[PDB]
Scaffold this active site. Structure first.
Site, PDB file in Angstrom:
ATOM      1  CE  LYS E  12       3.402   9.115   2.125  1.00 52.59           C
ATOM      2  NZ  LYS E  12       4.578   8.977   1.242  1.00 52.59           N
ATOM      3  CE1 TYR E  52       0.294   7.154  -3.231  1.00 51.64           C
ATOM      4  CE2 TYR E  52      -0.963   5.560  -1.910  1.00 51.64           C
ATOM      5  CZ  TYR E  52      -0.031   6.603  -1.988  1.00 51.64           C
ATOM      6  OH  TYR E  52       0.554   7.106  -0.838  1.00 51.64           O
ATOM      7  CG  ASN E 115       8.119   9.524   1.820  1.00 55.54           C
ATOM      8  OD1 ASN E 115       7.104   8.930   2.187  1.00 55.54           O
ATOM      9  ND2 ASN E 115       8.196  10.151   0.655  1.00 55.54           N
ATOM     10  CG  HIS E 118       0.607  12.782   0.116  1.00 55.90           C
ATOM     11  ND1 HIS E 118       0.959  12.384  -1.164  1.00 55.90           N
ATOM     12  CD2 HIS E 118      -0.375  13.702  -0.041  1.00 55.90           C
ATOM     13  CE1 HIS E 118       0.249  13.068  -2.041  1.00 55.90           C
ATOM     14  NE2 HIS E 118      -0.565  13.863  -1.390  1.00 55.90           N
ATOM     15  CD  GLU E 129      -3.292  14.319  -3.295  1.00 56.16           C
ATOM     16  OE1 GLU E 129      -2.946  15.129  -2.410  1.00 56.16           O
ATOM     17  OE2 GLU E 129      -2.472  13.695  -3.989  1.00 56.16           O
TER      18      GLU E 129
END
Lengths: 152, 152, 152, 152, 152, 152
Positions: E12, E52, E115, E118, E129
């Site tokens: 990320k 998303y 965080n 992913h 994905e």
């Protein structure tokens, strides 16, 4: 032939005492060199006097033999193209004060009498040291899976 | 005597082939455990079947002995308070799939048949394994300089 | 401007095969250089012959192309003050045996024909190489949050 | 007394901001050097100009004091045989551009004005710096358990 | 077959900004997983809204998309026995505070909204994905030289 | 508010003696927590009895005070979201035998009386310990450049 050259590397009593065995082996594994023999042992004065025979008629030879017999050592044999010479570059200068950061001595020790490791200084002496420390039986022959990616 | 417990740890052929010997040794040295014995060798099948005696009735016993005789291994002995059980925790679950990150198997491998390392499961088995793989001449007794900082 | 210089760094087939990708990228990140482009690909001979166009007449040329086409590679672009020159320094000498410990080649490889990585030799060639390996669209422009702590 | 030489080392604001404090400390601990003093603080300009007294006539003196007063610093004292000169080798050339890989500046930074760390250049300056930054109450005298394995 | 499973792992914006790219890739390489695809890109909102899509109705949805579009990311594909599930285990819990030491999130970050990484939650979503982030042409097929030492 | 929580972490005499200061600090820096205060010092029995006041009427309290006053310690204050609780998870179980690999105790020590480090067990006691070990003057307030990539 050239890729089959071998050298003798030994972790000294201070290297073992300071917990640097794993780290030193890692440097050689990482580089691509091949482990041929390895053992943990307490060297006898008889063996050390042989190993240090050239320090015979030099001052304080006994103190050297007593220090080297003051704790367990880790003798090893590594195999590879130009391993004797390259192995010495990796260890750094014998006198730690002259060792460059990045080398084993440059990163881990300070004084010449507590320089944690030994490496053969020439092919000829590597030949001598290996025979002194190991029986031809202790030398393992095997082939690394990545051999072709290390040498052409 | 409590702090003198010993266990047998062995880097399997896949661990050697993948260049994990130093890293494995380093995990034990940094923890505070004491190296007692170490060697690099190619295990014979006769020795392997003894080491694996308990799995004699297993259908995978033959291929197992076969696999372990396919490359060199690094057997060793470590000493320390509760080392058999703790050494086991460090290695992680036998099936790497269950091993947690932070353990040796969890960090370095994927499948049970290529689980890079062996550790005794109990004191009684550690004693047998140590005696199978090493001669009493090869177990070195020495004292680490930081012993009082590790054990009270 | 001076800080916007870019160089082309590429992990060769042997670096990918030997699992050095993350380690090599790590060296550049911890140093302060900014990642501008990155990809994993299998290079075609057509592409490799343009990359090595100057050696077209050398007798080893065809062998070199076949080798570079024998496994995937990781081409990338890094940005920073004097990155071409410093990039080279970090890699070490082309021939690993001349590479000093602390450099990428000094620490991880042995022979010149398996020297794991490539880095542009000049601003001029870096510009040419980047155009050969990447499209305009693949070069990412962003600003590191730590920028003012890396540059005056 | 030889082994009792001391030098002043300081992690600059960029070193703190980039999260390099532990890594810098680790390089000294692993080498065998002894930590004698340590603290985390924001240096006042009045202290900085004293520390930088020698560069008083320099045109970059004002911005320098200014920059060093822009974030917290980590001053410390290390003791050991020849630590001033060796500590300097470890840090690498003052201009990161000249610092070799393996040294702290060579591995972690790029430009002179953001060179992450300070080291005394001589014994006479180390003495002054130590006394400038620390009170005698803050220099701890203790003995490392491995001392005899580091120095004879 | 079981060994050919693939998962989508993505660094990320905060992971890239905090310099964790090489460290994260390193974790997967040392484990034995095979790198199949890798690139550095700035993700468009259009792309992020498809990634998303299921959260489209959540009140935080728009904030999440704007954040993921605020810095470059490093999407990649890894291949191996049970990689989706083991991939997740290596990352740790979504909320870093629940992540155990040894995992990527446990060792490197703190809050759920930052965080750093992913990883696909299932084989089904991993397939979706990968198709979203990469073209067929970007997936590299090769064979690791160490394959037979990682898998039975 | 929540991100401003602080905890007291201290490297014990055995942690300092075993050269683990740098390593321990690195774990916290890496995680993203903020260093607020730090110092090297020899704790006085008067201070230790205060720190260990709850062990007053417990057997062998004096031996604890004497051990803790047997060498220099490294007190620290770290700041972050849920740092007290998360910091304790990072240190691992108090009794090293119960600590998991990946944690500070799980990786570096063996026995409960030589468990290298201390961490506040609750916000309330962190509040107490910090005030006991540092003056409000020693606590440094600053802002990390990467703050926005660590917290939303």
């Amino acid at each position: 032939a050239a890729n089959k050259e071998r050298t003798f590397i030994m972790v000294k009593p201070d290297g073992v005492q300071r917990g640097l065995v794993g780290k030193i082996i890692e440097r050689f594994e990482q580089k691509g060199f091949k482990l041929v023999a390895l053992k943990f042992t307490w060297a006898s004065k008889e063996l050390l006097e042989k190993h240090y025979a050239d320090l015979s008629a030099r001052p304080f030879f006994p103190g050297l033999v007593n220090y080297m017999n003051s704790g367990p050592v880790v003798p090893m044999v590594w195999e590879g193209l130009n391993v004797v010479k390259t192995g010495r570059q990796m260890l750094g200068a014998t006198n730690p004060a002259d060792s460059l950061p990045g080398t084993i001595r440059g990163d881990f020790c300070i004084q010449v009498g507590r320089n944690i490791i030994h490496g053969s200084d020439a092919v000829e002496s590597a030949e001598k040291e290996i025979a002194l420390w190991f029986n031809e039986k202790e030398l393992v022959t095997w082939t690394p899976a990545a051999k072709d990616w290390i040498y052409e």
